[PDB]
Design a protein around this ligand. Structure first.
Ligand code: MS0
Ligand code: MS0
Lengths: 279, 289
């Protein structure tokens, strides 16, 4: 006997079998299930994942909120009021024991991309993320799953998961939401003192400088970015990397993605941007 | 969807094709049964198929795919028996409606990239000296489950450690599938069926009944307790011609980090010349026996 679903309001479920039943049962009524997986502490970035999911005709929106200890802020009532306010019908808020009842056992092993870039400082981060995402996919069985482009390496790895395991979901990447000066929305931004928040602008400045310098080629794009980062105090750059769209080596011409990460005090920030060489 | 002819054997080599047909069928009410195999089909595989057929309103998908990922390098893979001619003839004769026979290229377009990493059970027993073996198995079973999306999937108990790890896969990744273990079909003398029985010469074939004999002996000796079960099994194996034991182990039914209570599984693995043979049996320690 299917758990109660109240159409047009915010239905919260902690039990994975519950949301699974509501989901299956809604699919059959003709709704398309959309999954927005989050760690909670929601900001405008998350509301844009939600918004893109609501505009699918016939959509019902599932937002998961789960702090995944496997890969690594806890505003629980706030988060729900924020989803209520977006017209979201399902929140899935499992516990750690419910997600891992047999503890840590079978896990996803990422390919070699997971040892690069963000995988430098956090070599197990992505195995934990893929493990949890695969689980949510199997619990919710969404037609579409939504991820920010902010975490670009993470999005590419997800697409690799989906491809490699023959998963039957569409992965939608949603452009980064940004503050008025260009800073990419992040849970972390709140830690920045004013000096830091000031210097932080350099990351988005540098990328967009590069995207525009790139009619003059790859080297000019990279040199422009480096100069802008070099103009910022207290910004310790961990990498600045132009890659192909899939994150393999950057081709000679054609589409690319430029990524950067840097520490400002104890806070690590990421940003990335589309790049077209000689275009 | 591509052509589907009911009541006939339909063969698909594209994952998209069987996936499309699977889903159309499931949408019409039928329940999808998956029997994953490596071909060289014998009577134990037919018990799987039969158990699948007795699930009502089912359609049976049998996959045949020699998965290169579960093979340790040098020669085992090339040495694997392949008889797609017999295999397909048996499936027709059983009334199986769908065979899925993928290419390596279709299953691994990017080579090894994302994979399944088994829990700690995968390094024990068969996985000890074959440390990548079960990662290979779990990865293709997950992919098959995702292509086919069946309601139930069927495995033999002969490869007991495999079935347990698969149950682990299914629970740990929250897969929407019921796993059915099917009891081991045996030759008239007790020899467990295996694609690899064909590698035993007449003398080796005769000696081989030692495995199932040791085990059914232990299973009866077990009212006298665990040392008695284990020494009965050992004594039978010791008296057999050219049976070299690699392990004989008594474990909990989940094989895992529990001690044995009164219900266990006794597992044996032994070499007969170059052929490696597995068998195992349910054990109840006495009072439960
Ligand atoms: C859409 O713009 C964004 C920006 C960030 C995020 C995040 C995580 C973060 O806080 O780092 C999830 O979705 C986002 C979407
Ligand atoms: C049901 O009995 C069996 C026995 C063995 C097997 C096998 C493996 C093998 O051929 O070695 C696959 O399915 C079986 C089913």
């Amino acid at each position: 006997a299917i758990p109660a679903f109240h159409p047009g309001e915010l239905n919260v479920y902690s039990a994975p079998g519950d949301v699974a039943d509501v989901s299956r049962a809604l699919r059959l009524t003709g709704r398309r299930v959309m999954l927005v997986p989050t760690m909670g502490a929601l900001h405008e970035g998350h509301l844009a994942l939600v918004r893109a999911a609501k505009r699918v005709p016939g959509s019902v929106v599932v937002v998961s909120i789960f702090v995944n200890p496997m890969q690594f802020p806890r505003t629980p009532d706030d988060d729900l009021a924020q989803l209520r306010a977006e017209g979201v019908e399902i929140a899935f808020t499992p516990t750690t024991a419910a997600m891992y009842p047999d503890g840590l056992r079978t896990t996803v092993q990422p390919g070699p991309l997971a040892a690069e870039l963000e995988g430098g400082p956090r070599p197990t981060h992505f195995a934990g993320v893929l493990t949890v995402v695969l689980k949510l996919l199997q619990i919710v069985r969404p037609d579409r799953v939504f991820f920010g482009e902010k975490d670009y390496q993470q999005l590419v790895l997800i697409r690799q998961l989906v491809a490699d395991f023959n998963l039957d979901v569409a992965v939608v990447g949603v452009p980064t939401v940004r503050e008025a000066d260009g800073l990419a929305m992040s849970s972390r931004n709140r830690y920045l003192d004013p000096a830091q928040r000031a210097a932080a602008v350099a990351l988005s400045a540098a990328l967009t400088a590069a995207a525009h310098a790139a009619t003059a080629g790859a080297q000019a794009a990279l040199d422009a970015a480096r100069a802008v980062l070099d103009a910022a105090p207290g910004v310790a750059v961990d990498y600045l990397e132009l890659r192909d769209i899939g994150l393999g080596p950057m081709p000679l011409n054609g589409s690319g993605r430029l990524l950067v990460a840097a520490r400002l005090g104890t806070t690590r920030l990421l940003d990335n941007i589309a790049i077209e060489i000689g275009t």
